[PDB]
Each structure stands twice: as structure tokens, then as C-alpha cells.
Symmetry: D2
Subunit: 500 residues, 4 copies
């Protein structure tokens, strides 16, 4: 008996117990007489087309791969439930929050951002923490990160940001000039860059990190009154990080450390959990907040906006087939039930488009039919039909146009969205020069202690040293604007590296 | 009360009876408040991205279409059963034939060959008649036509043949020069061309035509002895044809005549049926047959090879959703259960490759998961995994490699294929100059009467008149080799047309 | 010598003249020794996998088809140029209008709306008239119809509208109940329905119809001042229509009448042309227009908004390969150069999303690389990379993130869009009960004469008679609201039909 | 000045020199005014659909990824030429070998086998070494490995083999039980397993390894006489390997070591080269060879079959865009010009099917149109048309059916394949119990010295220790059959590990 992950096949065999092996078939259910040799013209002659067993198997092997996710390609998944522990029905009418003790099944995927499918788990990166709630009002996807903020505040920069974090288009190598050119030109990134290069840049697996919705969302109650909120889901296992040295070692010894850790925890009954909270901001408070409350590079200070407990997330079930339940899972931030809505955060608005769009490419037009993606606790009834790999009844003979006089599905006025008046011209507004430094200073001065500040600067200088000097200079200038000691410490370390 | 096809929606409404309309949802199951107006900035302002209801619906509409079939694009489908009425277990051990009274569910699709999706039913063309038998040993697809023969006898000519029958690559028009250039250069086509231009070139809907497997197949019994066979399925409603004049009228008044006729027959309880027969030829008889018994341009004369009754096909159920059950159905001639095998017919051998191949393109890698294609009366267990739109459990945690020591599916030696010794070099053998005329003469002289012979020549000349004279001449020369009167009658009619 | 379309292959042969035939190759350029017979084990043995010539050809044949367009599937195309004849640079700074005599190459596709790829040209339907202008500021796609208006004024109804015009989801038949249920429930359709059932519902091929942009667009001049406009392109060959009887006959005798007519006109030097005009409306006039000037069911009366001549469209070149240049052409209304912009027409706004979206599905992510779609008179330089079937250099080693310090492409402030303030809440505003009848009455009373009014009512009643009585009644009620004689004439004809 | 790979962008900038930056455009060539901010309703309002610049860029980003290769996903590429140095025209009429000094352009891709796109270069694995020769008779793809043999000798086992080498289907972890269960059950693997776990299992980058065609091929001369051959391409830089300790370190410090090493070598003018040899075996020698000469687990001993020099491969050009020239390159073993043909090696026969098949999935039906895949030194002329992303002229108006009377391409009898008579039944022949040990013993005893034998056993035991004991036992039994010392050394090391 090794760890449960290592004993996967042995356990499968034992579960089968006395049962005879199934008969090996083709995809069309025809039994296979021999699957160890192909049909040839005599023992040393050529292969025949009529070996359809061979072609059937090989053609399917040839088509096994699908495009990886454009970001967050490397991941781990699990299933469990969300349980309401407190009443927030004064803020939201969403059915997922309807009453204390209400349990909703969930699916979760954890990931890194930049690495491809075959990359190591224990690298410095933000972590994805996506949660799908299968509610009676349809799926709610809260597609969070292990950070409350992000590097940029306008979505039209997101492809550029990702490109700068991935491989050089010619050499196919990671490129420090690209990374730091972009970040030095876009100092809105300082806040998340400070988080990334701190100790929480490398969590000790997925169970020891927090998640955040990051964006401001809108909650709407039964009386049609709205507030703004933030979602926080805090680890009940405690924050725990890997040192740079342990992370580097594990990246070679166990590239799949995060997958293995989660699988073994759940398989041995150590079910990880998170406490789910909201922060709430009224429309009036949004008018007077000193920054843009919809700016993704900003947090809401806890003193002014305390955490309000809502419930807990528990993961208690491993995937049975990774490809089916983790590779093919799709989260769309636009999947929000009545009672939860988007705010004007420009980044969130961009995400409302991007996710269904990429899913139609990565998975296919009918990706919502895939079992893990199905809103299986709701009844889907609409006027959508057809498309490739339509795997359901395609809504049978129901009338396929709306409005109609034949009793087909009808809109539900109670589900109408919340209306707001907005003031201004319709145009492109520059946000590059919003406050880039104030909350970063609070982090550097008040949240980090002295050891942490030192590791932060060493982590930064270790990466920034590989960029050209003109880039190093612009970057240090930005850190100086945060705090003269931040910049000067980094510059000192760079001097040492550049001397070598 | 009109015909059942016209009352489809009224019937759907009535079945619903008292029930309240379903709630209209997004694809993710979220209820929709209003699906008749989009979200705008004031009553005359631009559209917002956060109208995800709009985008969800429009994105799905945008992806509704899949590639049509490369041939046989226009079709009609129905479901029913096959019932064994006689014992042929001495010829075949296939479970579908196991005992008298055994019923197997079937799916059928009827089609024309050359026309696209929006083309008329009542045109001169061969008709497809594809039958899928859902057996306990997996699906058996008998992908037949309403003719026992075909235009060509080598599969490498099939793309050329189809191209010559479709549109000019520049003008996008049907092109008589292409059609008759090809047929005049390939006189193996004379036999099927004679069938096509006879009265049975335009059946009166799908219920009044025969089907044929066309190819020689191989039947293998429980003792491992093999014979060759042909499959014939003869209409119990009787042969009935449309005149050229009625067909032309219907092509404008009702392009969907065949679909409507079949749907209304089944909806009013007039279930069409076919009697299913085989012809049998022993290996010794195959050695002495005066032609190639595996030549698709040849029949087996009934005197020497009588029809042996096997059972009946009955269609008694209409599709509930056409797209799901007819557009997405896939038949592969290579889906043959134990007891039925391919013969060396070169055309059949080519089809063993082509159909799964086109299906992976038209439908997708996992097209066998689509419900209508699923071998739902068999248990599929194998080492195939993953691929796009994997809509099942993907065989869970089962071991995915063979051989293994963990109890996963095993080959079944009884399902091994039948072995034959073949003699000769492995090379390309010319078949262009096999007998092109003998069976055609028997058809023209002995099967057709005098009225039929006249209509045949008028039908040919009506089409051939549009080709250039050099093509008309080569074509007439080929008909003359069949019978001097065949050619001379055609030439007389051409003279009249070319004079005008 | 027949018509040029019929002599396509003969002409190709003659152009080749003395030249020896090319050597037949595989797709990989390897010469083919024999493409008329497959490789077998002796003359009557099975087919070998090592016949790669066979597999190469068959695999490509198997993948020839792409999804047809979801609407406007059946079409004809041609190439030519647009020439400026008058100066409108006071209204628009677009380079296509820059100076008198400036010629821009164009591509055009004509189509019907509802019919599939194999359907007849001479049917009652709106006609598409899409024009792609290859300008120095990129492609401008004016994706027009042969009508200035449309059936609906909100884009979220478009899928329903199209579904009601296509096949019943169960029977796969055209369904008058669906058509008239939808139109009777949505009387905004009365205006376009009146146009459709008039004589111009069936033009005599594509050369004898007008085109219209239909939507209000915005023109912006060099000083940044904006007006609203409509585009009209009026046939220089004159309006000409097919009678219902001639159209019905041609639908059987020549389903490709429109393709053939256009091809033969251009091949014999009868180059069709259109005169290109705008109507202009100032922002002040838009405030005082008695209807919504952005309502697609409304025209701008010519007395108040005269046609201003701009230039001419001439078609003088046939496609060389239909698939490459007509089937794969993609028009996106969102392709607008500086000086032309969208208006708030809700329908236009919906189209800005839908077309690139469907193109990524029908053609592929890199459909703009396809030669006919390429902006070949502009230089494309941006931060987009990769995607399937990347057929170019993928912009070589250029920096792939923006902003950057390495000299890669830069934004051009002069191309900034025009800013407007809008007033109101962000919500769904009902437009179902805008004026549905006033302009329709003007059409019925003042534009049509008495013979035309009679044919209109006969055309309507001929189609509406097949719907159920409750639908006939609601429809007649709507026509009555237009004019008591309109409704009563239709009702009289229906009485006769329903009596039979 | 760092290494050339690190200075990629700086070099690009400098090449541009004085030039003004290009204008940033959309994909349709329209200039972009501002690409740093999206269009919103006022500074804190929602995003508009009419920001088509945003949608265009984001939709393309969303579709950047294509499926990775099902095996050999992680790779490095380069370009150069092949030069003939000796005359082998007595063995082969292929134009690539036509005369001394003849240069043919080549493309090469190097890879590992099992790792995904984001995996480390310096891991134990076979290495791919694929060479595409762009000849005048079309492309020749020699899709080799850095080993002359492989793990299996029947292609129907290849999917199982690959599955056993990849991730557990439930846990998504690499699984030693899977690896060693398969290899212990299939002792034909002993030969390649011995190579893999020797020092050459981890080469020092791609320049310090040999390549081999591995399979027996057939060479055919101008007189139509055939021999069998093997292809060997031996590094001119010398064999050099990484120690297990250095490889492990580099896997964390530089996952892209192989890419970087090759790029920097070529960029600094150190062009790597290989000497290209054949071994030749006559048909008579094939009859008397003591093993199956077409068995992929066997070599031809050099004493009996000496290396015959042919020419040299030189790599002297880096990719300009990795995605376009390396990710999208496709090699098909079936691309063989006249003078080179397949042998009956069952593994090679399987590959003739699998590669074009997977390419149609990974890249698309028209993947041969992609510039790097194009046979750009040959003229492609055939009857293939259409398919998605047809990016060429689609062969214009040429006749699209064969045979034809209009002067379109013609077969070339000189390119006919070589004919052979084969003897036996057409059936599945078992090869599991061919000689699994004799050549492995020669390797262990005569090729490896004593230090090498020790490292071999340590490398094996280090991996095998993680499998269950029953698997360890079966594996050791197989090594014992090779040589009692091989097995006993491994068993000794296992005892130590299992004790811990
Ligand atoms: C070498 C010869 C042939 C080749 C390469 C070939 C290939 C094809 C292909 C690629 C399709 C489209 C399949 C799909 O997308 O689902 C098709 C359909 C069809 N073929 Fe064949 N075919 C050949 C000969 C024949 C023959 C001889 C028959 C009848 C005996 C036949 C009957 C049909 C029918 C009935 C369909 C439509 C099946 C359906 O309803 O989905 N074909 N063929």
C-alpha cells in the first residue's frame, strides 16, 4: 500500500473483485477477436485496409488531443459542495444563498496561469481557483484567483500581458525582457507584482491558499435593491508557502505536486475547506470611495469593509476521469443566476465575452452538453438548436421560434436585470494614470514584516536581473515611487548581479 | 386537421395540454427575464456586452450548421425493426439472424446522391437506402442503394465520378460535358447508366423502391465455414415510379416530397416494409462465375442464385428531431458484427476507409457517442480515450493500455475474422476492360419491354444532347456496343435535338 | 459554341493550347504512376494500406465540405471596382471616397436568405447584396440587401425569425404555421412583408435589383463632424421582375438561373453596374424625425432626404474558382474604415458581433488570411498571433505585446472613433409597439398602383392560406390596421381558398 | 550583449533601424486609434459591443491554441540543406540522390516522446529527429528517432504503449505501474528499454545525438531493381550525454535547454551537421537473415551490413516564427518520392495511415497548404479540391475529374511502384514470441563496458522500484533471460530500494 494516487489501478482491479473482464469492442460495439496483431498478407507481408480494428483504434488515438486552455492550462480538479452557514438574503435573492444549511454541489479547478500542460506545479505564478455551483437557477461560475487583484485594469491589454508572460515568438523561450518591458511600461501592475514576488507567489499546493472573486460584483435582493460585493474564500487549512529552494527542487522531483497533494488529501478523507465571505459596499459608498471601486488593481480595506460570513466550500470527491471532468470543464464568469450580476469593472466586462468564446473553440459549440458543464440541477428550455456534436434530444419537436402560439418556453419577468443610469460620453477613457502606488505602499509597509520585505526584493531582483539595463532602470523607478526603500533594495541587488 | 406533417406544432401543443410553459433559460440554465429586447444605453443608445442573453443565443445560432454529407446530402429518416422470419444460421452466426421471430431495432436514412441539402427529392438519381441494425454484437450498418450495381468498379475513381456529377468548379453549374465526358471515358458505367435512365431512376418516394447491399459480402457460420452473399430488400408496397413530367412538376411544387410522404405514411399508421433476402454463392461457384463475382457493375442472375428469404424491415417511428436523428446519423460499412465480413470487392474495400474518415470530419472524433449512432444494445469497453466533445464517462478510471494485469477488457477469440489465401503480386491491376456490356444487353433486351426501351433512350438523349458532339459520339459508340438498336435510337434522338 | 458558362472546360483546354498536361501529383508533390486502379493482393484480393495515393485522394474528398452559411447559403459572386464620381469629402474622410475618379477593387456576393446550398434561385425571398471594398485603410464590407428595410427591429429576434423561415425541427419541412405565427405576432414585419410579396420579391436575376445598406450609418469628416447616412446602390440595368409563373417554371428548369445569368453577362462583356448614392441626415434632423431614424423597419422619405450621388459599382470579372472566391468569402459589417462608423441601430449593433463570430466557425479562426478576404491593399500589422491554419509568416519575429520598447506597430490617434453622449438607463427597452403601419400605408396607397395591389394580396393569400385559421385571422387583423382594403382583399382570397 | 536567443527582440529592433513603426491595424487592415483602453459609457460605465477593436483582438487571442501533437509534443526546429557526397544511383533513382554536390533544402524538428508542450527537454526519453527534404519530386519525410529500434514491433500496440507512458486516466499522474506493467508483459521492448536506460537516454541537446530511419525501407533504381535499406545520420559534433544529476538540475533551471542550445549554435555560426549513410540488404540476404529483417526491434549488424556514405545534413537557419515553422510543421512517412518505398515492416505500414490522419485533426484538412509543409520545389497538380481554409487558388478552373478529355493533369507511368509476390494467408500473425533477447545480449555484453552496465542497472532500478512487486518480478525475469547478471544486478538494487 503506497499513497492512494499510486494505487489507482490496484484499487480499480480490487473493486472489480470476482467479475470477468468485459469483452473488448470497437467503438461501434463489435467484439474484437485479437487486438495484439494486425492483418497482413502472410507473416512478412503488407497491412490490409480491412483491418478496421486497427484503423478504428488508431484513428481515435490520432484525435485524442484538444487545444489546451490559452491560459491556466495546467490544473487539478475536485468536487464537493457549498453550504450556507449565515443569512445574506437581505443582500441577494440568489437561490444558492436561500437558507441556512442549503447545500449546492460544486466543481473546482485549480491552476497556474502561464505554464503549458506539461509544466511544473511549484513555480511562481498566480493560481486560478474556479468554482462552479450547480444551482436550481442554473450554473454559477465564480472564476477566481488566489489574489484579490490583477496586473492590469483594462481588458484590451490582457492578450499583450499574457503574450509577455509566455514564450518569445521566434525562440520559443521565456523572455525576461518581454516580462519586464511590459510591467515597467504598465505600473498599474505594481500591486499584483508585489503580491506575486512575496511568499504567497508559491503556495504549498492548492489546499493552503485563499481564493477571491477579485472583481466587484453586484448583489440584488428580492425588493430589487442592489449593493456591490467582493467574494473571498479563505483556506481553513491555513496559508502555507513553499520556499524558493523547495519549490525549485519539487519542480524537478514532482512537476505534478499540486495534483498529487489534492488527490491524496481527498482520497484519505482530509477534505479541504474554505470559508466563504463577502464584503459589501453600498452605491453611496461607491460614490465616495477614494479610488475607483471597480478597479481590479485595488482592494477594499477590511477596516472600512469587513468580511461578512456566508458559508463554506468543501472538496470531498476526486475526479473519476481527469479528461472528462477536469480537462473539459468550462467556467464562464457570465454564468450568474438571478441575484448576482456584473459590475462595471472593465476587466469583468471583457471576461463576459471571452470565456464562452474560447470555450466554443477549445471544446466545441455544444460544450455546455458535456456532463461536467451541464446545469443538471436546472431545466434548460430555450430556442437554441443544432450545432456540432449535439448529444442530447435537441429539445425534440418543440417550437423553435419565439414568440410563438404553441406553448413553448416563456420568459420570466422576475429574472430581469437591475437598471442603472450612467453618465458620460461613449468613448475610450484612459485609466493608465489612476493611482498605481498607494495600496502597494500599504502592503509593503504595513502588511509585510522585515524578513518578508527582504525576500520580496530578492525574488524580484532574481528575475529582473535578466532584463536589459534600460528595462531594469524603468522598473526600479516604478518601485521607488512605491517606496524609496523598495526601489533602493532592488537596485542594490541588481548592482551585485550586473557586476558578476 | 391537415396532414400530420402540417399539424406537427399543433400536436405538440395539444400533448402539453394543461401544463404551464417551461421557463426560458440560457444554455447554462439561468432564467431569462426578457428575450424580446436587447440592453442599450437609453432607448436609442448602443448595445452592451453585458447582454449575455443576447450573445449566448446569437453565438449558438452562429454555429448551428455542420458540413453536409459530401454525397447523399438530402435525406429522410425513420426508425423501426428488423424481424427474422427464416433460419439462415447455416450461413451466418451473426446474432441479428440468431432465431426466428428475433427483432432488432433499426434506423434508416433515404437520400439522393448528387444534390445538396436544399435540392429537390423528385430528380433522376440513385437513391441511398442505409440501414443501421442495433444488435447485441454492436451496430451493423448496411449502407445500400436502390440499385444492385454502381457506375464504377474501382474506388480511386469515386471522387472523380462524384466531381463529374456535381458543379463545375468555376461556374458552380451542373455541367453535361463533365457528366458525359466521364461516363463516355468509363464504359463500365453503362450498366448503372441504363438503370438510372429507366423508369426506376425516379421512384415515387422512398416506400416504392427496393434496396440492395450491392456488394458481395461474406457470411461465416459457427463452424467457421464461409460463403459469399448479396443482400436484397424488396419493397412490400410495390415498385412505383414518377413520370418525368410529374417529377419535374413536383420538383417545383414540393422539393421535399419524399420526406413528407414517408413522414405522413408513418404518422397515419401505414408502416412501410421490405422483405429481406440473400443470394448465396459458394467459394467454388465464385471460382467458376463467368465474371468477377466481386465486380460492383455485375449482378448474380436470379436463375443461378435464387433469393433466400431471411426476414422483414418495418418502419414504424418518425424522428422526433430531424437534426439529432437524421442529419447526425452516421453509417459505416465497416461496422459488421461477427458472422458478416467484407469480400474483396475493391469498391467495398475503399468504403471501409472512407466512411469513419468522413464522419470524424462531418460530425467529430466522438461521433459514435451521438445517441443515434451509439451501439446502445451492446456494451462498449476498450482502450480508446478522450478526443473532443467526450460526452460520456470516458470509461472512468479503467486501465487504458492493453495488455494489462488489472482486469480491463479482453479480446474474444471467437470473434476472429475468417482467413483466406490469395494469389498474385501486390500491384495495381487494370479492370477498365472487364466485360462492360453483357449484363447490360440482358437488361435492355430481356428485362425492358418496348415502351420502356423507348423512354430509356429519350431520357438519355434529353441529357446527352447538352454535351459537345465529340462527347455525344463517344457515348453513342458505347451504347452501340451494348446493342446496335440502343445506340441508333439514341443517335436518332440526338440528331433531332442537335438540328434544332 | 454554346453560352460561355457551358463552354467553361472547352475554353480552359484551348487556353492551354499546345502545352503538355501537368504531371499528376499527390498533395505532397510526389508524382503518381497510376490513379485509375488501387493496389490489391493479386487481381481479386483485398486493398493494401500502402496505397497512399488512394488514401491521400480519398481523405481529401472526405473533407471537401464546410458548413454552409447559416443564412444566405445560396449565392453568386463577381469582382469589379467602385469609382468615385462626385465629392462627398465634406461628409466623410474615408479614403475610398477621397477624390473623383478614384477606383477601389470590389468583391460582390448575391444570395437568397432562407434556402440551403442546393435550393432554387428564382424563389420569393429578400436578396443579399454584399460588397467588399478593398481600400488602403483596410476592407470595408457593406453587407446590404435588395430592400432598404427588414422584418424586425431588435437583433435578439433574428434567430427566431430565421428559424420560423426554415424547416420544422421535427418534419424538416417548410412550415406556413411557423412563418405566419411569427409574422402575425410581430407586426413590425408588415413593412418588409409588403415589399416581399410585391413584384420585387422575385427579381429577374441579380443584375435587375437595387441594393441598400438598409441601416443608418455614421459618416465622419476630417474636422471630426458627424452625420447619419443611408447607402443606396441602384441598378443601371433597370428593375425587372419574374412573374410568379415564370419563377415557378425556372425553379424546376434552372435552379441556378441567377448564377448563370451573372456569369454569362460578365463573360460576354455586358458588365452590370449600379449607381451609388447616400442620403444624409444631420444630428438635429435625427432629433426631430417623426420615427426612430435608427429603426430598420423605416425608410427616410426621399422628399425630405434626397439621394446624393457618390459613384458607381461595376462588375467586370467572374470568379476563377467558385469555392475559393465565393463560397469562402466573408463579409463583416464591423469592417469599416475611418470616416464610416456604426449608428445606434440595434440591429446593426447585433451584426457587429454575429458576423466575425460565425466566420470563425464556418471558415476558421484565420479566415481573414484566405486570399479573397485579405485586406491586400492595406498593411496588416498588429499583436495577433497563431491560431489554426496560420498560412502566412505570422508576423515573423516581431514583438507580440503592446506597449513595447522595441519599435513594433503603434496606434494612430487620427483613427479614433467619434464620441457621443447618450441619455438614459442601461436596460431592455421595448420597441415592439413603435409605429408598425404608417410607412406601410404610404407604400400600399402611393407607391403601388391597382394591378400591383391586387398581385400583392394574391401573393400573400397564396402563402397564408396554408396556416391555421387562428393565424390567418391575426395576420388579416394586422393588414387591416395598415389599410381596410389591404386586409379585406386578403380575407376575400382566403375565404375562397379555405372554402375549397 | 547576452546570448543571441536572449537578444532576439533587441536584434529585431536594430534591424528596423530608422524606420517608423508600422500603423497598428485590425485583422481587416483598418487602422486602430487607441488599443490601450476599451469603449465604455462614461469613465465608470459598462463596455459596448461596438468596441470591435477589442472583440477582434480578444476573439483571436481566444483561438490561438491548436491541439498539441499526440506524441513528440515538445520540440525544437531548424532549416538547412542536404548535400549528396557519394553516388548511390545504383540503388535509388530518387532525384534527391541524383548527382554529387546536389543540394536539397531541409526542415528538421527534434523532440521528446511522452512529455507535453510545457515539459522539460533534459529528461530520459527517445528523441525524435524528423527531416523533411523539399525535392523536385515532392517532399520526402524521413521521420526518424535517435535510436535504430523501437519498443514494439506491431502498430496496434502503439496507442497502448503511449498510454502506458503518459498519465494515469484518473489521477493525471505519471504511473510506474503502467509503464512497467506494459513493458514486463511485452518483452520485445527489452532492446529499446536497454538503449533508453543507458547513457544515450539523455543526450546533451539535439546536436550530440544520431538519427535513424529505424525501419527497413526499399530503394528502387532506374532499371526497376529493388534493395532494402536502413538510413543512419550520425552526428558530426560527436555523441555527448548528460549525467542523470546534470539532467535533473537542468530540468528545473532550463526546461528549454535543447531549444536554446540549438538556436544559439546556429545564431553564432556553429552549424551542426550529420553524416548520412545507408545500409543495404538484397532480397536474397533478406531471405537468409537470421531474424525478421523488417522487425523494428532488430538492427542489421554493421559487420554484415556496412554503412555506405551518401551525403550530409547541415542546419544553418533558425525559425523566424516558431508557431508557423515548427509548431505547424507536419511530417508524413508516406511522403516518399519515386526511388524510395515502404518495406513490409508492420510498424512502418501503420505509420503510413496514422500521420496524415492526425495531421488533418491537429492542423486541418488543408495542412499541406501551410508554407512550411508545402512541396514548394515541386508543382502540385491533381483532382483534389476545396476543404476548410483553402488558402490557394484551389487549382482555378481546371477540370476536376479524371480521366477527362480537356488536358488536365496526367499520371506518369515511370512513377509506378515496385511489384512483389507475397506468400501466405491474409490473417493476424503473432509476433510476440519472435527473438526478444539475442541482440539485447550483444548490446549488454559487447557494446557496453562495465561502468556503463552499472549505470544502466541503476537507471532501470531507480524507475522500476516504484512499481508493485509482482511487476518488478516479471520485469526482472525478462532481464534475466537477456543475461543472468543483468537481472541479478537489477534485483540487487531493487532489494535495497524495497527495504528502505
Ligand atoms: C468507393 C465507393 C464509395 C465511396 C468512397 C463512398 C463514400 C461516401 C461518403 C464519403 C459518404 C458520406 C458519408 C457521411 O458523411 O455520412 C457516402 C454516403 C453514402 N454512400 Fe457511399 N461511397 C461509395 C460507394 C457507395 C455505394 C456502392 C453505395 C451503395 C451500395 C453507397 C451508398 C451510400 C449511402 C446510402 C450514403 C448515405 C448514407 C447516409 O444516409 O448517411 N456508396 N459515401
Amino acid at each position: 500500500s503506497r499513497d492512494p494516487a499510486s494505487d489507482q489501478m490496484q484499487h480499480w482491479k480490487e473493486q472489480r473483485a470476482a467479475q470477468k473482464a468485459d469483452v473488448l469492442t470497437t467503438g461501434a460495439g463489435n467484439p474484437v477477436g485479437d487486438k495484439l496483431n494486425v492483418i497482413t498478407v502472410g507473416p512478412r507481408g503488407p497491412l490490409l485496409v480491412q483491418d478496421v480494428v486497427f484503423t478504428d483504434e488508431m484513428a481515435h488515438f490520432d484525435r485524442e488531443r484538444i487545444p489546451e486552455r490559452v491560459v491556466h492550462a495546467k490544473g487539478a480538479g475536485a468536487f464537493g459542495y457549498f453550504e450556507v452557514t449565515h443569512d445574506i438574503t437581505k443582500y441577494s435573492k440568489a437561490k444558492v444563498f436561500e437558507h441556512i444549511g442549503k447545500k449546492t454541489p460544486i466543481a473546482v479547478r485549480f491552476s497556474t496561469v502561464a505554464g503549458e500542460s506539461g509544466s511544473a506545479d511549484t513555480v511562481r505564478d498566480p493560481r486560478g481557483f474556479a468554482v462552479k455551483f450547480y444551482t436550481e437557477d442554473g450554473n454559477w461560475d465564480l472564476v477566481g484567483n488566489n489574489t484579490p487583484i490583477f496586473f492590469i485594469r483594462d481588458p484590451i491589454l490582457f492578450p499583450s500581458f499574457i503574450h509577455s508572460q509566455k514564450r518569445n515568438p521566434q525562440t520559443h523561450l521565456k523572455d525576461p525582457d518581454m516580462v519586464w518591458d511590459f510591467w515597467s511600461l504598465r505600473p498599474e501592475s505594481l500591486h499584483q507584482v508585489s503580491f506575486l514576488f512575496s511568499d504567497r507567489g508559491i503556495p504549498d499546493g492548492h489546499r493552503h491558499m485563499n481564493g477571491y472573486g477579485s472583481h466587484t460584483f453586484k448583489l440584488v435582493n428580492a425588493n430589487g435593491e442592489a449593493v456591490y460585493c467582493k467574494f473571498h474564500y479563505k483556506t481553513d487549512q491555513g496559508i502555507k508557502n513553499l520556499s524558493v529552494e523547495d519549490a525549485a527542487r519539487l519542480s524537478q522531483e514532482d512537476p505534478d505536486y499540486g495534483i498529487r497533494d489534492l488527490f491524496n488529501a481527498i482520497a484519505t478523507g482530509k477534505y479541504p475547506s474554505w470559508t466563504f465571505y463577502i464584503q459589501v459596499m453600498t452605491f453611496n459608498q461607491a460614490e465616495t470611495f477614494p479610488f475607483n471601486p471597480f478597479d481590479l488593481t485595488k482592494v477594499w480595506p477590511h477596516k472600512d469593509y469587513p468580511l461578512i460570513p456566508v458559508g463554506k466550500l468543501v472538496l470531498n470527491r476526486n475526479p473519476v476521469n481527469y479528461f472528462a471532468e477536469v480537462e473539459q470543464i468550462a467556467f464562464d464568469p457570465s454564468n450568474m443566476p438571478p441575484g448576482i450580476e456584473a459590475s462595471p469593472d472593465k476587466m469583468l466586462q471583457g471576461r463576459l465575452f471571452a470565456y464562452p468564446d474560447t470555450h466554443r473553440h477549445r471544446l466545441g459549440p455544444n460544450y455546455l452538453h458535456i456532463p461536467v458543464n451541464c446545469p443538471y440541477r436546472a431545466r434548460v428550455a430555450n430556442y437554441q438548436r443544432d450545432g456540432p456534436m449535439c448529444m442530447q434530444d435537441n429539445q425534440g419537436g418543440a417550437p423553435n421560434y419565439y414568440p410563438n402560439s404553441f406553448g413553448a418556453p416563456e420568459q420570466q419577468p422576475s429574472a430581469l436585470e437591475h437598471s442603472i443610469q450612467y453618465s458620460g460620453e461613449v468613448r475610450r477613457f484612459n485609466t493608465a494614470n489612476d493611482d498605481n502606488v498607494t495600496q502597494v505602499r500599504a502592503f509593503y509597509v504595513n502588511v509585510l514584516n522585515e524578513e518578508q520585505r527582504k525576500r520580496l526584493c530578492e525574488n524580484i531582483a532574481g528575475h529582473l536581473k535578466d532584463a536589459q539595463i534600460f528595462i531594469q532602470k524603468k522598473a526600479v523607478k516604478n518601485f521607488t515611487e512605491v517606496h524609496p526603500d523598495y526601489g533602493s533594495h532592488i537596485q542594490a541587488l541588481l548592482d551585485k548581479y550586473n557586476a558578476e
